[PDB]
DNA sequence: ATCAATATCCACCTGCAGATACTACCAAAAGTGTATTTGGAAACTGCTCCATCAAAAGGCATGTTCAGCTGATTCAGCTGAACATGCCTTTTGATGGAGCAGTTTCCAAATACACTTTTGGTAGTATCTGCAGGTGGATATTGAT
DNA sequence: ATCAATATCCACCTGCAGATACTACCAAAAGTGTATTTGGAAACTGCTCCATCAAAAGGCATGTTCAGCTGAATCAGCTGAACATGCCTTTTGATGGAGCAGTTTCCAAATACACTTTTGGTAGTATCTGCAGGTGGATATTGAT
């Protein structure tokens, strides 16, 4: 009965934005889920650490940004910081 | 005709793994050596999975128990939850 | 009476098994091994089906990788035949042992 | 009532992510930006991977992405291979790769 | 001038109990301090992950113990576990 | 007023361990016996390292434990060696060990 | 400020003898002549990786001074935990 | 005039440096190298002296370990002279490359 | 070289295991209104950190010599690849029931809050002691003969 | 073996840095004692999904044969170890100045918290179809002659 939450869905939307004529298997989606959870845990935990190292009690987007830089390779880190920065701006610039 | 479970990991199976591995030619002592290695792998993972199981007061080892056991042994596995 | 030269099937089998993703150990025997091993830590245990498939995926992935490294060790020593010592050297350097 | 996701321009769920941050014991408090930023980074990487997986199914004359496609897309990309260097992709197999010295001479 | 704490004292007491005629250099003590902070973090971390996996909001001595088992090797575990359990039993019965 | 340490019969500070479990964001709540158990576990490991380090100091005719003695102790003990397999002890050096084939003659 | 001498080619301060000494502590009896440059390359990469990460901690704390802790945390991230300098 | 044969001082040096723990690279050069590299990441940085020492302790420990692995790779190929390919094979199997 | 044996690729077909699609709740996001909390923005310290000068050693650079290691070459013997199939273990699919998971309950145990008491850290001075680094000088180790 | 060069060993001996020793102040913990909240163990049980097993399935054990790989042996060439020599650069230890970590005190801005709407996201159910295998015939690769 009880709810089993996943990203299997946001993933499907992104798939449709990126390859509208392409589907995905059950297993494949399982992998993508693990992926999202994994990266989520890596970034959060590193953010958690930064905040603690600086005796701060709060995880802001700056802790996320720094984490992403520490966790991701060169270009990957970089197309990513932009995306993240963009989202924040757009969410802010939105009455 | 009895047999050691570990010997259930057959020379042809082991060879297949090696072939996925890109290996062209195999000494005959590899099969026993491989069995040993494989046993220590499963020992380590299973020990940690089972530890998770008992912590949950269960009598079933779940995919998550395994996944988590894998993760902390530095063998993270995608596709079985988590 | 036709006959392929030593090496030619082996290569063929490499090209084959690198192309595919099916498991390569037979399930029941892998499954029995899991249970034998687990019995030593806790008795009368049950395993989700997917808990056993997880294990099998992980082991196979581990061993194939070890074989890649093992093979590089044989090649380093100017051989093309993988011996135990190659497996020991790879584990040694991976930090799994010694 | 407007989802923070739609405000942010995102498919991925800012709310859910905000919540997972609260209840994973990462810190006493959580900025408003933090889950937007994170959600966008997760969506981004998801995209990049689906994109390359996509192409790999296409290349194999297929329309439905399977774990294999995800393996070919990750291990053939230098940066994704690094990010996921200690991860096993179930049902992924391995890249076709034979050491030159093992190839037949004649 | 701010109070920077360490486990120097505890470490020195335990040293006197096991080698009463033996001293410790401040470099060596720094190492010991690193060691305790490290093991502290490793156990505390495993226990946190553990509780969370089992949807508990509480880290009890039971989560410490399972962490210990996950973290330490064989004979170190066995012994750590007995000293642990022994310290709890005694503590519980000493109010 | 009895410290919770003496109550538990420990040298290591239970209160301090309790506080660190709180401030480290490990979970919502901390059971009363966790810091007791944990402080005991750390006390035991430190007792164990000190024992072997002391011995190593005495072997080298020394009264004072320096970092080399911690390193000799840790690396000559299988289990400590494993527990600390990815750790560097500053000023530790390495274990004397020369591969047999490198020694002269036959 | 007034001047501050340009730093260039300091990798060469990792001299051949120093490298030979590191190798001896690692048990090595005979050393190919090409090892020296190869080791300098490997060393540079390891330092760049650690320093990159430490400096990222420095910038995040808004300091201009890289601390031992900054280094210690970079080391740990990178699976080369170091005892003896704090943390 | 007197000559030790090739290897005999090598073995002496191994026993000597395996027995001691002092840093084997000169401090001042190592420090310049650390400042060069960081300066290329961010200008106008200062370093706590113990930061530099930490870096140096950590680099020397990393290379000493890599030299051990490198040595095992040479011996595996029936040599006693470590070569770049030995460093390369060790790094690949470590997952550094 | 040509030629036969056999593996591999490619085009097409088609049932169904496994996708995608739809519906309809509902847990959990969003909206609202107070109730804390926090991260600075300024405004000062005392540091460590940087620079720099001079003396001094301790180690670095270099060139020469040749020991002995590496890699080439050659080869015999041993050892693993390739080989056909029925015996037998694994695979598949059908069926009771173990126990995971859903739900509810309630108190032993947790947080919270405001006092009271103590200890662990530092800083000022003071003393001490282990051992680093120097000294011969008696005991190996090595390599030439 | 025997002999000479030189590295090694060890043990005693003074200066002294780093260790231990108080002393004393105190500020921040830690502890103590109510008042208050609740997490999760305990007990009951619904219903997946896991162990068991019967018939259907197809991979593997076996023993023989010899291709070609591995490991041994020899050896010429040249690379890297040892060592003497000349002297640059690191080490060591001063001195000043300041750039900057590290604090503290006040709020405006931000985030948590209790309470109510208002969906987005899930489970359960209902259609829909991509492609896993099958076959047929052309084509490519391998190995013998
Ligand atoms: Mg530069």
Author numbering:
A (entry chain H), E (entry chain D): 28 to 122
B (entry chain B): 21 to 102
C (entry chain A): 38 to 135
D (entry chain G), F (entry chain C): 14 to 119
G (entry chain F): 16 to 102
H (entry chain E): 38 to 134
What does the paper say about this structure?
Histone proteins package eukaryotic DNA into chromatin, yielding a structural hierarchy, in which nucleosomes comprise the basic repeating units. Each nucleosome consists of a core region, composed of ~146 bp wrapped around a histone octamer, which comprises two copies each of four different core histone proteins. The H3–H4 histone tetramer organizes largely the central DNA of the nucleosome core, while the two H2A–H2B histone dimers organize the outer DNA regions.
